[PDB]
Paper text:
Certain nucleotide reverse transcriptase (RT) inhibitors (NRTIs) such as tenofovir and lamivudine can inhibit both HBV Pol and Human immunodeficiency virus 1 (HIV-1) RT, leading to speculation on structural and mechanistic analogies between the deoxynucleotide triphosphate (dNTP)-binding sites of these enzymes. The Q151M mutation in HIV-1 RT, located at the dNTP-binding site, confers resistance to various NRTIs, while maintaining sensitivity to tenofovir and lamivudine. Therefore, the structure of the dNTP-binding pocket of the HIV-1 RT Q151M mutant may reflect that of HBV Pol.
HIV-1 RT Q151M was crystallized in the trigonal space group P321, with one p66/p51 heterodimer in the asymmetric unit. Gln151 in motif B interacts directly with the 3′-OH of the incoming dNTP and the conserved Arg72 via hydrogen bonds. The structural analysis in this study also showed clear electron density for the Met151 residue, which indicated that the side chain of Met151 is flipped out from the dNTP-binding pocket and is exposed to the solvent. The structure also highlighted the possibility that the hydrogen-bonding network among amino acids and NRTIs is rearranged by the Q151M mutation, leading to a difference in the affinity of NRTIs for HIV-1 RT and HBV Pol.
Residue numbers in the entry:
A (entry chain A): 1 to 553
B (entry chain B): 2 to 88, 94 to 217, 231 to 428
Write the structure that this text describes.
Amino acid sequence: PISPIETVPVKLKPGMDGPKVKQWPLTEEKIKALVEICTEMEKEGKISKIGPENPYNTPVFAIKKKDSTKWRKLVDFRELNKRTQDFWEVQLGIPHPAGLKQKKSVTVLDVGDAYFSVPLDKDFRKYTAFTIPSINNETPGIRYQYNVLPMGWKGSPAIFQCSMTKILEPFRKQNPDIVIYQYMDDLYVGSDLEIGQHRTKIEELRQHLLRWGFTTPDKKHQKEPPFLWMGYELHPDKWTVQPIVLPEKDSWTVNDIQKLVGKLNWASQIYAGIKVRQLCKLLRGTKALTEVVPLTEEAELELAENREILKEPVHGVYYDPSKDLIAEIQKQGQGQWTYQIYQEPFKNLKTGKYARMKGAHTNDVKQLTEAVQKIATESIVIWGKTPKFKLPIQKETWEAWWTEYWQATWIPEWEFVNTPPLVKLWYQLEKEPIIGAETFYVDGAANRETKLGKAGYVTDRGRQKVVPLTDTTNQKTELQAIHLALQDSGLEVNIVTDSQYALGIIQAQPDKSESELVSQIIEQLIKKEKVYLAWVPAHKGIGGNEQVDKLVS
Amino acid sequence: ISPIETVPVKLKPGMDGPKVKQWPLTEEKIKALVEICTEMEKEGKISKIGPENPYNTPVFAIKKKDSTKWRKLVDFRELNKRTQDFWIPHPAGLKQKKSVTVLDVGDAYFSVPLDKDFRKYTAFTIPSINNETPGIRYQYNVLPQGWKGSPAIFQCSMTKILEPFRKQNPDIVIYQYMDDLYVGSDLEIGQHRTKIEELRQHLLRWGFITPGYELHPDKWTVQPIVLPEKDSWTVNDIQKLVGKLNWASQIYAGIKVRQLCKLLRGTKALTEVVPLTEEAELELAENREILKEPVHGVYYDPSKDLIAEIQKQGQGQWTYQIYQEPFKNLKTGKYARMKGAHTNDVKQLTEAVQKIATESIVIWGKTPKFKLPIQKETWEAWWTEYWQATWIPEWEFVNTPPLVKLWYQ
């Protein structure tokens, strides 16, 4: 049926006209298949025949269903979508099963026949024109247009979700206690109500949807646990991610790949390590949805590892507002962080991994800070509140960090959990010069034309040094010069530099770095007992800074 | 009500409307905004819209000082930036008043309708917990709060309601910025509060306010560049002084470090005490007299933007400078610590930004563009939790561990 809901006004992009893409030729089998399909959705009012005055056209294909003899009417709206106005994505994300409160009565309704039930703006309908071609190229083709939201058109998801929401609106007011989640095909309805009283409310909703042109098949109607909902299996006490099976095809088409990527993108939110880069690279340079795409070596290996990842079972419990939210973080290798969000011990709501691979120089303290923020933000999205944190860092460690850190930083309510590897400041620069310690006056320079340079030091104990450097820069030689001072010295040192760059990155006190140079400097600082780093304005007649600058330049 | 003519409002040439995403909100704030928006919808102030509106502007909830009622705040910074310019001289006398009270007259804007062709640009979204429902979308039908077009369009109506009070009190300065009203006088504090009460009652009578915060510009002190005072100067202490004087020479003239650099001869140890020569004591002394007062000849350009840099000095102290061109400060200052934020840097930073912006409003009638010494993710996560103003200034994030830290304290 077709909903009596008010259409949503749609326009093309400013200065753009409708699509005029020529229809490709088709087999007599495919053509006659499309004629049978179009005939059915013509008498159901989903499409209408149009006159020869309509200049617009969008290509259509005829593909068979997966393991079925039935034909599908596929339309390539890529040209119309480019010319269609932008819509605002209202949702801030996907509903998480752990965001659901436990309900005594649960029903998941199938509203799959929903796209072809929402009317399209009458002014826009002409731009969705398509042609069923003729084999003889002499008989004119049958031309239709959509009266309803087309599958694959840019505005279909947004306008549908908007339509559904407005239709569900009065039912939710009449039933503020009943929880309703909508997401395309699946319609979740939960209540702490007796079955008979609940099932009656279900029929009330279905009749409400039916009057608004939305049918709910009793075949896909789910009555008893477990309930399938958005790729999740809902049990009364727990929820389980249903096994995600990836297709196995000899010949992949463009349509197949993008559907795979879309599916893998959804799974990447639940599973860690899901990659789609090598599959997306296959798509670049394609012209048709039916175009066959050969999997490269990197692509088929990427798909293979994705399969192994999706084999891991994922499950969790439901949310209980009466208990507090607890979030615990622990440090792992390669700057990776894992976390669990629970309320009762060993009853996780959400489990995930955070891989921090953005930046050159950092420490475990800053990485933990950013992890807390990411978790706090997620919790607000799902539960509307921030959790109490359990962090593997001493209260003294953190206090020594934020009080000396030039930059403003802060962490919410948190208690310490003693479980290695703990987050620790591996070193700390002195606030005052070290007495009795050798004073290294450090400088370095480099030729911008030849990438050649020198680096060295002069000390108050008469010790001097200068080392030739190749393939370096003005910034690299300044770090190498400090690195030299750390190398040829005791466990306590004063280092004077004129480099604002070199000074800056050591003030942040990093414990890990992409640079082999910085990493070695970090290793040196850890082995040292006391290190004071001082800055001096270059070229102003400062003693030690003078002798070392002339020796390097 | 009879339809009154809306003034035609357009965007700047070549500019499209605001397309900014809504950030997550807590359950408490969502419920508060829902209740507020339902009321505004019933009163015709806002209308529900669909996805065919490609524009969006962030919304959130704050609580003003000396109040417990939830206040709806919309971040129109992107829209304001793209909105046409509307063409009030800033009252210079406002800065020289003993007491300036801040009144919120934001509700007055909801009396004037907004141009129908412009309403689409005021779209905003109330998010839902766990995305149970797609966010509730609204747009404005009347003049929105936080939009720079509102005080401009409503200016004529604002001058009429203040005309009786401004004649009865010719020595009382009233300035308007966005939703806030600044009322300043040299009157005694006891008699002052009775005058602002007389004004707010006059505003309550005509629906400018719907059923405290005092400022004292004379107490706003300048933070000068100070030089250390020691009897024993190490080589390190000399180097620090040279570095501070070298930087300060970019702002002030006649600053020299020749006599001080002579003390740094040979290859000295950092902890070595070096006796100051009589000419080094002289050079230092005359440098102090230069840094005693602010630099002359630094004029405020009404066309150019104001810039504010902030430094964290620790112990709850924060320094800040306001300029339009580098090393030409219009104002410098330092804020002492305050109880309640003893362990919260972000809370201290947010309060500092509001104070600086407030002072900038009183002095120049404009908020400065802030360079915040904080990570973007850290600030954007909790800054709303401590915001109490109805306006929001521009800001960016800087990450340079400075020597400029002790170059101001």
